[PDB]
């Protein structure tokens, strides 16, 4: 139903008609539309199965959405066409120029023998090429070749400096933006990535992949690899550090140099920070930099542990990483730890435990980012917990060691500890701090700086080697709270400011009351055998204040204290070992209203 | 999270199941909870020869100490009538996560063989031990044998 002598207007007609009445078993004369000039018309959505177009000139055409299974376009033209979302299954497109947008255009089972996708494109979804015959075709980089079919190779080596040979076909490089780098970015130019093109040919073409790979290198400028371009260097590692690429020397030897500087720069830039997830190529490549440079094990310690935590878990390379680790813990800075009462398997074997089903064993051993002979021991699960603000933790979930000697963590400043020795847990901690309002409340209550900055800097730890029970120390404290307390109850004037300030102003009786319990709980711990007071003598001015807070809470909403047997025993203790009481009240809060407790009580006392 | 405290005790128990403590016997704990233990402190040095401690492990353990508490009436200047004890080893000033239980007991035990009025939890008989000794040993073997 065609002849190329009917104008571009006469032609549309015949076609749109065709789409409508679809016989299926049409006659050769009906389906024949060959040599016809179709330059410029829309044919979107049409049903053009089995149609003949051999010779047709579809340049500048928009055939998107339309069906074309079983078509025959042997020798057609497509300069700047649009074929997105199309269907071409089983079509014949041998020896035919395709220069168009082929977004998600399905070529399954098509004949592309001797076709050339000179400078095509797709924006987010690649064409489909399963069972497509590309033998002799010229494909452009970024095209996913999975399931596809390229010829056995005609010329092992390739001539023209513009084409790369992968099997039967050619990977043109004319329109490459004049820089071999664009074509090597898996992460951001995934649609232009020739590393993607190569790495997705069926296994059958492995030798070709290596042949091609080796040939890609002679194209790469190392003086143009100066600029960091991290996603390209990264990209290189993931693609070419995998079978069959591993075995070929001429390649590998080319990577070491290019990989060392990179992964070095990486381990450095991401030290004391969370480790970016990486493919097998990348990950492995990192392990080798740690094998080659036994020093970074220490210079980028945190950066090192995480790598090894991902390695150890990574199927296909688990034992190689487990090895590298047990060569690290031979360090005179680590060994002391390894032979610890309860580390690793606990067998006293001094070796890490790799057979766990909840990652709660104590294998990982970190070293201080400063020279102060400090190193902690932890569990993957714990290491994780203490990695996020929101978690309901207290950043004490580990074993601290000064010069291989166990320690009472509590006598340590959590800030000064995470900030100078193990800077990783520092971001998660100093945010869980910002969130905690205790320090903001303690800013309203007291107003004497000489003292104020003396209770805040002690709420970042548990036990304090600083006392204030002396006849002259209680002389400093009493001076402060005399104007606030009222014997052993809350001086009415205070309850004015309290329930009025930004603290409780506009807060339901439920939550308003709730809060008071915590703040009351705070000062108990202050006068605890653990803190300012000794277990023999305890600062009576604080215990005093406490009593008022636990009380003025009661008259706000008793549905917070629950039982009253409790309330009476709470006072029957605070008035007449401030230690036993603290947790006694801390544990009930994490139970009765955890959400308000993780917000109004020293993170480091949780 | 709290499956890790149970994770350590398990190890700590088998160690006891083998060697065994000679001054602490009869430790009974169901495999479910495990956050608490029961047992008997049977001393060999008078005046306590002629007690059911109930050590209660916390969840965050071993990053907090255990709370050894007495489920039996005792006449000690360091043990409150509620059973409470002011122990140094399980105190938040001497607590290292590396302490076993066979050590927390060997401490709580050796305390009764040589008490201390330095950290007394009862002024009921603190001075009593101080001035008249025979009065705390002729008034102890009694209270020990009455309950």
UniProtKB/Swiss-Prot annotation, chain B:
Entry-linked PROSITE patterns: UBC_1, UBC_2
What keywords would UniProt list here?
Answer: Acetylation, ATP-binding, Cytoplasm, Nucleotide-binding, Nucleus, Transcription, Transcription regulation, Transferase, Ubl conjugation, Ubl conjugation pathway
Q: What is the effect of changing residue 93 to R?
A: Decrease in autoubiquitination
Q: Which domain of life is it from?
A: Eukaryota
Against InterPro entries, the record matches this protein to:
Ub_conjugating_enzyme, UBQ-conjugat_E2_core, UBQ-conjugating_AS, UBQ-conjugating_enzyme/RWD
Return any one Pfam family short name.
Answer: UQ_con
Keyword Transferase assigned? yes
Residues forming the catalytic site: 86
Subcellular localization(s) per the UniProt record: Nucleus; Cytoplasm
What the entry says about post-translational processing?
Answer: Ubiquitinated. The alteration of UBE2L3 protein levels during the S-phase of the cell cycle is due to ubiquitin-dependent proteasomal degradation. Autoubiquitinated in vitro.
Q: Which GO terms describe its biological process?
A: cell cycle phase transition; cell population proliferation; cellular response to glucocorticoid stimulus; cellular response to steroid hormone stimulus; positive regulation of protein targeting to mitochondrion; positive regulation of protein ubiquitination; protein K11-linked ubiquitination; protein modification process
Q: Name one GO cellular component term.
A: cytoplasm
Tissue and organ expression note = Ubiquitous, with highest expression in testis.
Record-listed E.C. numbers: 2.3.2.23
Instruction: Mark the residues carrying the PTM N6-acetyllysine.
Output: 131
Question: What CDD domains does UniProt report for this protein, alphabetically?
Answer: UBCc_UBE2L3
Q: Which family does it belong to?
A: Belongs to the ubiquitin-conjugating enzyme family.
Its assembly, as annotated, is: Interacts with PRKN; involved in ubiquitination and degradation of misfolded proteins. Interacts with UBE3A; used by the papilloma virus HPV-16 E6 protein to ubiquitinate p53/TP53. Interacts with CCNB1IP1, CBL, ZAP70, RNF19A, RNF19B and RNF144B. Interacts with ARIH1. Interacts with ARIH2 (via RING-type 1). Interacts with NCOA1; they functionally interact to regulate progesterone receptor transcriptional activity. May interact with NR3C1. Interacts with NDFIP1 (via N-terminus); the interaction mediates recruitment of UBE2L3 to ITCH and causes MAP3K7 ubiquitination.
Task: Summarize the protein's role.
Answer: Ubiquitin-conjugating enzyme E2 that specifically acts with HECT-type and RBR family E3 ubiquitin-protein ligases. Does not function with most RING-containing E3 ubiquitin-protein ligases because it lacks intrinsic E3-independent reactivity with lysine; in contrast, it has activity with the RBR family E3 enzymes, such as PRKN, RNF31 and ARIH1, that function like RING-HECT hybrids. Accepts ubiquitin from the E1 complex and catalyzes its covalent attachment to other proteins. Mediates ubiquitination by the CUL9-RBX1 complex. In vitro catalyzes 'Lys-11'-linked polyubiquitination.
Instruction: Please give the name of this protein.
Output: Ubiquitin-conjugating enzyme E2 L3
Q: Which organism is it from?
A: Homo sapiens
